[model samples]
Target: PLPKTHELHIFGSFNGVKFDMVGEGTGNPNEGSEELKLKSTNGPLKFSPYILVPHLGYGFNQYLPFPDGMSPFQAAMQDESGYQVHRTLQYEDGAFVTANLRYTYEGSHIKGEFQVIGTGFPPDGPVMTNKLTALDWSVVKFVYPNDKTILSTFDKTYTTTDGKRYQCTFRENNTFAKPMAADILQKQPMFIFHKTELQHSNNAELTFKEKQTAFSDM
Candidate 1:
């Protein structure tokens, strides 16, 4: 059985694109699965519509549990009135993923997270081959407009893993937006940053504003 809850911190970048998220999942294994919530630490950043891809065994990736044949990305992009809850596939190793996504149309905002469960992958699986984990290499594609071009140019500094830092500048066309359906307007920018890194380096901490926690004798 899986733990009642677990926390995972993810940090990865495809090419020069980087992303980081903190996730919390709740549920047991076997007959039950976990649900996840991922929140970003980047400053008021937005995301273009993005999809979730799985590397589970055969026939697993082909299932679509949402309506209108919507992919996870499309389901995530839907307005509050059009949202759906979907379950991810369970692997031979007994792990799975799931999500609940919501977004706004006017401001072009998007928010959501994904999950990984069970004991992870088997020793013979692709994820255990010294290259990637079950969540590694999962691609999220989105377009970030150049709205912060000036700010990034004059005020931003990007730091590398080696501790070197450099002033960063974004040109007017540094990035472009992908075409969307007629009903969807104003694509949002995707902000991907390391949460714990920001907390330690920039003093950007995570806060559960109205939520409370306590310890009790069981």
Candidate 2:
């Protein structure tokens, strides 16, 4: 089984293009307005929308959108101890995708480390990037977004809604892959940061009001 990650809200800008990613889970969505609610550092972002029906659970990218009508037939998981989860999706034609996610704790804050690799050629496709909606990249047990989520231009860090500031990392050239294809790369400005400190907030209602307003919108 995959990690319990639900509702991962990914926002970043690559090559002057802003993108916000969301997922579909075990809940009702916002009708025809699924593609709205985006505020960017530049202008509008690019997206192909999430799957409405036949959703695996919650989260938009929990189950990747593979165009055509193809779906992952079988998923195998390796054993995990704690603060982590790992899974591999196997296709019929020997092509497969392996995704791994690990977590770290910083007092009241948290950080996630994810790595994914595709072996050989995918047996499922109209083509990989031809009409891809969301990449089957990373998975987690919870969410990365909050009512007050924001990216910083000064130090390039991401602060989630609930309090303690959080961060994720990326390699050179602004891409987050290890064995990467130079043909396919997206710049993630928020993931480029060196974390040093953790400062937890004292006021609880400060975040409560902001979080409540976000839910009331949907």
Candidate 3:
């Protein structure tokens, strides 16, 4: 098994060039309709089921038109229909057994929300749709107290370009072969700063009178 905790880092750039297929426009396009593009330097962010499973879920890197000149937070906050903008990490080989990390029996059902705090948004972002849609990632972990195996699961949700919502869930056998390097378990839990919602306005009607609300500490 790997460890209960894993430190991950992701790098990327946003310059309206990564997504040229979104529309037919010049390098500098009109406001609100300009072609935004981006590229990930870190290329990927890993979400191990061993620690956290989100209430919403993950996936959406292959499809959808990711915004160009916006941060992950800005992009996520723009989508009207709600969509996660991170590429889910999966076993490179079809064999889940060899790909899976190892772990031991902790005698607990280890399950809760875990998040990494950083200066800027990397994996946290929204998908590109006609309206604003916020994407979400979650984890669900199960373990046997005695000498037994463990399972890590992840859930994700996002919207399509044509106004359709989609969701998926994934599982891994083990994520850790040994105990975590630090006493991260004693640290403050990752509190959801703001939760995105599927508002009525996101409906097909796009009703002008639809109701909406923002959940935040500010």
lDDT of 3 by residue, 109-171 (tens): 111121212122123322212322444433333332322222334454444444654354545
Model 3 C-alpha lDDT versus the unseen true structure: 0.23
How do all models score by TM-score? 0.25, 0.26, 0.25
Candidate number achieving the greatest lDDT relative to the actual structure:
1
* Comparison by lDDT, 2 against 3, better one: 2
User: lDDT per residue, candidate 1, 125-205, as tens digits?
Assistant: 432332221121111222323322111111223333334432212112121123333222233322211111111111122
Backbone collision count in every prediction?
1, 10, 38
Of candidate 1, the 10-residue stretch with the lowest lDDT total is 55-64
Candidate 1 deviation (Cα RMSD): 18.6
Assess the local accuracy of residue 87 in candidate 3 as a C-alpha lDDT between 0 and 100.
22
Off by over 4 Å in 3: 1-39, 42-133, 137-141, 145-149, 179-218
Residue pairs in clash, model 2: 4-141, 5-140, 5-141, 23-59, 23-60, 24-59, 24-60, 25-57, 25-58, 26-57
Error of 2 at 199 (Å): 32
The global Cα lDDT (0 to 1) of model 1 is 0.26
